[PDB]
Symmetry: D3
C-alpha cells in the first residue's frame, strides 16, 4: 500500500505556504531536496512531539513535472485554468513547487522552511510566502468558523487520495491554492444576518441555514456539488488567515485537496461563473484572488525513491 | 499604588511590535485611542483566558509627548541617541508610539493590532511592524536560550518601574527598541565553541562561562554593568525572532525595559563603543541594527484618565 | 457502514435525553434525524480537539413502527419489566434517546438545546439527566467505573450489528436505567463489605480472586459466557448525577451491545437471581426508576 | 492583614450555588460546620490540585447573623431590599447561608456540597440549588461574553474587601445573589444589532459601543456608576449559566461581591427603577429575577475561630 | 527585605534529595558552588519554563557551618538529636549539605543535580540520593493523601521563615529530613478502618476523624501541637514516595521546614517518646527511620554574597 | 485476527524495565500471572485515563519458554548471542521474563510493577530494575535527540510484528535489551563537531550529516542496513536515559523491537565486530553494555488463553 504525504493532518493553528519557481539548471538540486524532504520534516519536528504537530506537504506543478521526471504523468495534472467571469476573475500565477507547512506553532513552520530554502538557494525563485494563523475558536478573517464540513476518516481518504483510477500515482492528491485579499471595511458594514446570507451558516453557532432560507448565491450553496450518482463531491480544505495591519492586508489563503482537480475546478466555476440561479458566489464581493496554482502532491515513497 | 501596564508579563511565544508616527492633526484621535487601549485589550483577550495571555504595552516618544500632553515630562524622556562607533553604528529612526503586543498565539496579537490600527487610521503613519515568534525551547535566531538572566519578582519591579525619583510618573518605565538583522551564513560558519565565546554561555546547556574563560568582548561580559556601589544594574528584555525565508531576512527584535534609560544606554555604549579591554560586542559582527527608538510607557491609570 | 459514535473516548460530562413522540410529530422527528450529525459537527467543531462532543441517537420499538416502514432490526422490542422476588426493573416510556457526551457540560447543553429547539411541539420530555464523572473515574459508590469495558476489535465485535442482520449492520442496542442510591446505608458498610458487594478492591481496582469473590457480587453476576466459552461483553458508560438539596445521588446506566439478549441475560441474573445468588447485592443500595431499550442505527441510515 | 475567603478566585468553568435556611434549634450544628468549612474545602480539593481549583465562599444573611453571633454586626448587613419598579420587580427571597462553590469540574463542586450538607442535615432547609456551567468562550445564556470588565489585582481588592471603615470585619465582603430566567424565544427574535443595543457591547468581538451610539437604557450604561469624586464604583461578578432543556429553563445566576452593599444596591436601583433618561435596564425585558438575597462573607479567620 | 530560597514552592510531582559530606580540604570548592547555585538553577530551568517549576533549596549542617563560615551562627543550628524511645528510635546520620531539588519532571531535577555534583567532584562524598515521585492523587506509599493540612500563604511564611527573633539570619529556615522505609506487608494486613485509626483521617475522602473517634496515638493527634498562648505550631512538609520494587523497598522521604527546629523536634519527641496518653505514634509501627539530619537553609542573598 | 501487545506505544516520558529469572518450581505461579497481566494493566491504568497511557509489554526468554510451554516455539527465539569484538564486547546476561512498563508518569509504572512483583514473590529473582525518564526535548544522556528515525504507521507494523512467516505466533515481536553506561567525562571533552562525527547527525538541529561527510564508523552509518532487495531493514527503539548522580552512573537503556531478531543482531554485529571500513561503532568508545538479553513478546491473546 503506498504511503501518502500528511494531506490528512490534525488541526493546526499555524502554517507557512511557500511557492517557488525552478530556475534554469536548478532541476538536480530540486530532485535531491525532494528525496530528503521527509527526513528534514522528522529532523525539525521529532524533538517537539507530541504537541508540535509539524508536517510538510510537497506539491509539483504541471510544467515542472516534465522538467523533473520522465515516464508517466499523473492523469489530472495541468496548469490552473484562469476563470474570466462577468464580474469576478480567478487569476493563474506561476508556481513549480508548493511547500504546505503546518504545525501548532509558527516557529516550527519557520525552522522547516529555513532548512528547505537553505538547500534550494541558487536553484529556485520565491513567488509567494504566506505566514498563516488560525483564530483561537477556529474562526477565519471574516469571523466565521472554518473547516466545519471537511470530510473525516474514510470519507476523507476516498475524497482526497488517488486510487485505482491512476494506479502509478495512488496515494497522491491534487492541491489548488489561491491567495485572497478581503475588503474588511465593506464586510464589517454588513449586519450579522447579511453576512450569514453570504456564507450560508449562522455566525455565532455555526449551524447551517435551512434549505428554504439559504440563498442560492451563498458560498455553501454554490460549493455544494453532487456527482453523477447524486452523492456529494467533497474536498478537504485548510484555509488560513494572514495579514499585515500596517499595509491593511487582511487575507484568506485557500488550499483545497482532492483526488481529482475536476471537483475543485467545478466548485470554482460555480463561484466565478455562476449558475442558472446565481450570478456568482457572494463571498467574491468581499474577496479578490491574487494567486492561483495547481499542484500534484505525490505519495511519500515516490519522493523518497528519487 | 499607581497601576503599571503589563511590562512584567509571563513568558509569551508570540508578539507584534508596531511603531507609528503621528500625522499632522492626529493628536485628538490618538488621545481617544490611548484612553481606550486597556479596554480593547480586555475585549480581545478576556474570552481567550486563561491560555491567551494577551497584553499590550503602549509607549510614547519624546517629541510625541509634547504634542499630546501639557504639564510635567518624565525626567528621562529624550530622543534615542545615535552611537557612531569605530566599526558599528546604532541608528536612530522615527517613532512616536509603540505598541508591544504579546500573547501565546499570533492570532490574538493580530486581533488586538487590528482594533488599535482601526481606531488610528488617518491619524498615523506605520514605521515598523514585526511579527515575532519564539522557538519552542526558548531559543533565539542564533540558537541560544533567550531571557535566562532577566530579573524576577521584587528585583524586576525595582529594575523596571519608575518610583520616588520621579513621583508624578511612578509605575512607568522606559522602553528601547532596535530591530537587528543577522548574517546567519557567517554565524553558522562558526563552531559551537566559537559561538559560545561570542555570547558568553554554553549553547546546549545555557550555563554561563566562568569569569576566567568568558572573553572580555563577549555579549554577556559587555552587558554586565555595576553601579557606583557595586550593585548589578539590570534591565528586562523580551527579544523576539522574526523573518522571511524567501527574502533571507533573519532577525532579532530587541526590546529592553528599565526604570531609567541611562542603564540601557550604558549597555549600548559598551556594545557599540567598547571598553578599555574590548573594541565592541562580538555579537555585532553578526547583527546589524536597522531601527532605534526610545519610549516612555506610562502607568495604566495615566492613560485611562485622559 | 459508518456507525454512530457508540465507541467514544472517555468523557467527563453527559446529557441523557429521553422523549416520546406526540401524535402528529413524526415528520418533524424524521427531519431532525436527517440533520443530527450536521448539528453535532456545528456545535462541536469550534471546540476541537478537546471538546470530544458526540451524540448517539436511539429509537424505541413502538416509535420505529410509527416512523419507518419495511424491515425492523431483528432484536428491537420494548424493555422487558423484571419482577424479581425482592427487586424490580421497571419499564418506562421512551421513543427517542439522545446520548450526548463531551469534556464539558456546556457543549452537551448547547447541542441538547439545538436538538430540542427543532423538536418543540412534536415531542414530550420523559427524562433529562446531566451526568458528571469524578476526577478519578469513580462513581457515586466510590468505585472506579469502566475498568473492564472491551476496547479495539473486541469492542466492535461486542457492540456493532454485523452480517446476522445485514440491513442494520453498524447499528447497536442501548439499554438505559436510571438508578437512585441509598448512600446512608452504603456508607454504613465497611470498605471490605463494599468490596464483597462489587467484586473489586475499592482503592486499587483489582478484581477479587475467584476463591474470595462472592457469587452475588456485581462482577460475578454480570460475567456471562457464550456457547463456546468466550465472555459475552457489553460497553457501558455509567454516569453519576444528583441533587444535594433533594438527597438524590444516582447512577445513570447505559449499556451498548450487538444484541439485547446479552444485556437482558445480565439483568435477569441481577434482578431474578440464580441457583447460587438471590440477586445482585448492588441492588440492596440501588433502585431502578426508569428502563428503556433503543436501537441506535448506523449514521448513514439516519443521513438518508 | 486578616485572611479573606477566596472571593477573588481564578476563572472557573463550574459552580454550585447552595442557599439554605437555618431551622429552629439548628444554630449549634451550623456554628460547628462553619468552624470546619475551610478544612472540608482542603479535604475535598487538595488531592485534585493543581487543576481542580476548588474553593468555597461562605456567606451569612442578616437575620441568621443575629441568631448565630452575639457581638457586633458588619456595618452594611441587612436583608435584601425588594425593588418594586413601574414594570420590573426585584423580589427578596429567604436565605440564611450561602455556599458559593467553584472549581474546574462540576464533580468537585458536588463532592464538597455533599460533605457540607451531610454535616447540616436536620439543621437546615434547602431554598435553592443551582449547578452552573460556563460556555467554552466565556459566553452567557444570551450569547454575550460575561466577566470582561470585572476589576483585577489591586483594583479588585479595593472594590471587594472590607477595610478600615469597619475594622472588626476587615477582609470580609458582601454578596448579592439573584437567579434570573430568560425569555430566549423573545431574545432570539431580536436582530444581533438590537441585542447589542440592549447590552451595550458588540456580540461577536465584545468591544464596547461608542458613547455616541450606546443607549442610555443599555445594561452597561445603567450599571456604570461614578462616586462622589468621579471615580468608577466597581463590583466583582461571577455570573453563571444554568438550565434544563426539557423544561425550557435558560438562566443566569447572578452573584456580585462588593466592599459595601450600597454599590450593588445603587446598580440594582438604576436597573429596576430607572433614571431620568432610562425607564429601566432593557436586559430586564428578557430576564426575570426569581430570587434575591444578601450575605456577608466574613474573613476566613473569623469562621475558623468559632464555637 | 532579605530574599528567601524557594522553601514555599508550588506543588511538584518529582524531586531529588541529595545529602553529601564535605571532604577534608573541600571547603573552598563548596563555597564557590554555593555562590553559583541560584545561577545554575536558572540556567537549567529557564528553557523549560513556565511548566518546569525547577527549584533547589540548599541547606548547611551545624558542623559544616563551622568549617565554612566564621562569626555568628543561626541561633537554632545544631546536629540532629537522636531519639531513643522505648520501642522506636530516630537515628542521626551524617550530612553536611542538602540539595532539595523539585520540578514537574524528574529530568529537570537530574540535570540540575548533575551540574551541582559536577562542580563538587573531589570535594564531597555522597551520603544519600533519593528520586521522589508523587502518586497521581497526592497519595503516599501507605495510600493516604499527603500534604492536606500544610499551611498556605501568610500562615506558611510565618511558620517557616526566620524573622526578628534571629535578625542576622532573617529569611532562612530549618529543614529536618528523615528517610523512612515502610513495612507494606504488615500495613496491608490492617483493615481500612484500622489504617484510618493509625493516621487519624479517612483513607478515600481525606476527611479528618472527629475528636470523639480520633485515637490519642494517631499520627494527626501526636503531630498537632499548640503553643503556650493557644496558637497552632505548624511546619511545612513536602514528603515524597520513593522505592525499588525488586528490593521490596517502599519509602517516604520526609522533609519538614520550620522557623525554629524546636517545633519539628517537639513533634518528633511526641512521635518517638510519646505523651501521657500515647506510648508512641502508631505510624512508627509500620515505618522505620534510616536517616536523620538537620540543616539551615539561608536566605538566597546570603549564598550569593559568598 | 490476533491482538498484539502495546509494542507500538504513543511516546512516553517514564518507563520501568524489570528483568527477572524464574526460580526452580516457580513456573505455575508465573503462568497464572501471565494470564492476568492485561487485567492488572487495566486495573492500575484505567482510573488515570486518558492521559496516563500505561502499558506493559511482557516478554519471555528462550530457556524460560521451554520450562513454561509445550508445543511450538517461535521460530526466531534463542538466547542472546554474546559478541566478542577485538575491542568491545556485547555480554549475554540471564533473563527469563521482561516487563517493559511505560506511562506518562513514573507513579503509574511503579504501581503496576508493584502489583506484578507482588504476585510473583517467591517464584522469581530480580536481575535488573531500571527507572527511565525522558529529557524534555527527547534527548538522551549524550545530548542527542533519540527516536528520530523510528518507523511510524504501517511501516512500523511491518517492521515489528510477526506475520504469515510464523503463523502460530502472528502478532508477536522480538525484544533485545542492553543496559549501557556512558563515560560522560570523555564524551564532554569532545567538541560538538567531534560528537556529531560519532553519531552521524547534527547535535542541536538533529539533521543527518550528508553522505559525503558522514564517517563510516558513525553510529547512524553502522545501524543503517539494507536487505536482499535493497529495502531498508528497520527496528523500533524506545531507548530511555537513567542514572544516579552520586554513583556517577549515566546510562541509556536500549530496547529494540523487530519482527525477527536477525535484523537487530545484524546491527549489533556491525557495531561490535565492525565492517571492512569501520573497526567498530564509535559510540562504543563512550558506552559500555552491562546486560544483554533477548525475549519473545507474544500476542496479547496468547497470554490471556493460558
Ligand atoms: C447501580 C447501577 C450500577 C453501578 C453503580 C455499577 C458499577 C459498576 C462497577 C464499579 C463495576 C466494576 C468496574 C467496571 O468494569 O466498570 C461494574 C462492572 C460491570 N457492570 Fe455495573 N454498575 C451498575 C449497573 C449495571 C447494570 C444494570 C449492568 C448490566 C445490565 C451492569 C453490567 C456491568 C458489567 C458487564 C460489568 C463488567 C463485569 C466484568 O468484570 O466482567 N452494571 N459496574
Ligand atoms: C440577567 C442578568 C444579567 C446578565 C445576563 C448580565 C450580562 C452582562 C454582560 C453580558 C455584561 C458585559 C460583559 C461584562 O463586563 O461582564 C455585563 C456587564 C455588567 N453587569 Fe451584568 N448581567 C446581568 C445582571 C446584572 C446585575 C443584576 C448587575 C448589578 C446588580 C450587573 C452588573 C453589571 C456590571 C457592573 C457590569 C459591567 C458594566 C461596565 O462597567 O462595563 N449585572 N453584564
Ligand atoms: C513516617 C512517614 C510519614 C508519613 C507516611 C506521614 C503521613 C502523613 C499523612 C498521611 C498526613 C495527613 C495529611 C496531611 O496533612 O499531610 C500527615 C500529617 C502530618 N504529618 Fe506526617 N507523615 C510522616 C512523618 C512525619 C513526621 C516525621 C512529622 C513531624 C516531625 C510529621 C508531621 C505531620 C504533621 C504536622 C501533619 C499535620 C497534622 C495536622 O495538623 O493535621 N509527619 N502525615
Ligand atoms: C549506547 C547506546 C545507544 C545510544 C546513546 C544510541 C543513540 C542513538 C541516536 C542519538 C540516534 C540518532 C537519532 C535516532 O534515534 O534515530 C540513533 C539511531 C539509531 N540507533 Fe542507536 N543508540 C544506542 C544503541 C543502539 C543499539 C544497541 C542499536 C541496534 C541494535 C541501535 C540502533 C539504532 C538505529 C537502527 C538507529 C536509526 C539509524 C538510522 O536509520 O537513521 N542503537 N541511536
Ligand atoms: Mg436482603
Ligand atoms: Mg515485606
Amino acid at each position: 500500500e503506498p504511503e501518502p504525504q500528511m494531506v490528512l493532518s490534525p488541526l493546526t493553528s499555524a502554517a507557512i505556504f511557500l511557492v517557488v519557481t525552478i530556475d534554469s539548471g536548478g532541476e538536480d538540486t530540486v530532485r535531491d531536496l525532494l528525496s530528503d524532504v521527509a527526513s528534514l520534516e522528522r529532523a525539525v519536528g521529532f524533538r517537539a512531539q507530541p504537541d508540535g504537530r509539524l508536517s510538510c506537504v510537497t506539491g509539483i506543478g504541471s510544467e515542472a513535472w516534465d522538467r523533473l521526471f520522465s515516464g508517466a504523468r499523473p492523469a489530472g495534472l495541468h496548469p490552473f485554468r484562469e476563470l474570466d467571469g462577468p464580474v469576478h476573475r480567478a487569476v493563474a500565477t506561476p508556481g513549480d513547487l508548493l511547500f504546505h507547512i503546518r504545525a501548532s506553532r509558527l516557529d516550527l513552520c519557520f525552522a522547516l522552511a529555513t532548512e528547505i530554502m537553505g538547500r534550494l538557494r541558487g536553484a529556485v525563485t520565491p513567488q509567494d510566502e504566506v505566514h498563516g494563523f488560525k483564530y483561537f475558536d477556529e474562526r477565519d478573517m471574516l469571523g466565521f468558523v472554518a473547516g466545519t464540513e471537511n470530510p473525516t476518516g474514510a470519507a476523507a481518504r476516498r475524497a482526497v487520495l488517488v486510487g485505482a483510477e491512476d494506479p502509478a500515482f495512488a496515494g497522491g492528491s491534487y492541491a489548488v491554492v489561491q491567495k485572497y485579499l478581503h475588503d474588511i471595511d465593506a464586510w464589517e458594514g454588513l449586519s450579522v444576518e447579511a453576512q450569514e446570507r453570504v456564507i450560508g451558516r449562522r455566525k455565532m453557532t455555526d449551524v447551517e441555514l435551512s434549505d428554504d432560507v439559504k440563498p442560492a448565491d451563498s458560498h455553501v450553496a454554490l460549493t455544494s456539488v453532487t456527482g453523477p450518482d447524486g452523492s456529494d463531491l467533497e474536498i478537504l480544505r485548510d484555509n488560513m488567515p494572514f495579514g499585515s495591519v500596517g499595509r491593511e492586508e487582511f487575507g484568506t489563503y485557500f488550499i483545497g485537496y482532492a483526488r481529482t482537480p475536476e471537483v475543485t475546478e467545478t466548485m470554482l466555476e460555480r463561484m466565478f461563473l455562476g449558475t442558472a440561479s446565481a450570478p456568482h458566489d457572494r463571498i467574491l464581493d468581499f474577496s479578490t484572488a491574487v494567486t492561483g496554482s495547481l499542484f500534484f502532491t505525490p505519495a511519500a515513497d515516490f519522493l523518497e525513491d528519487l
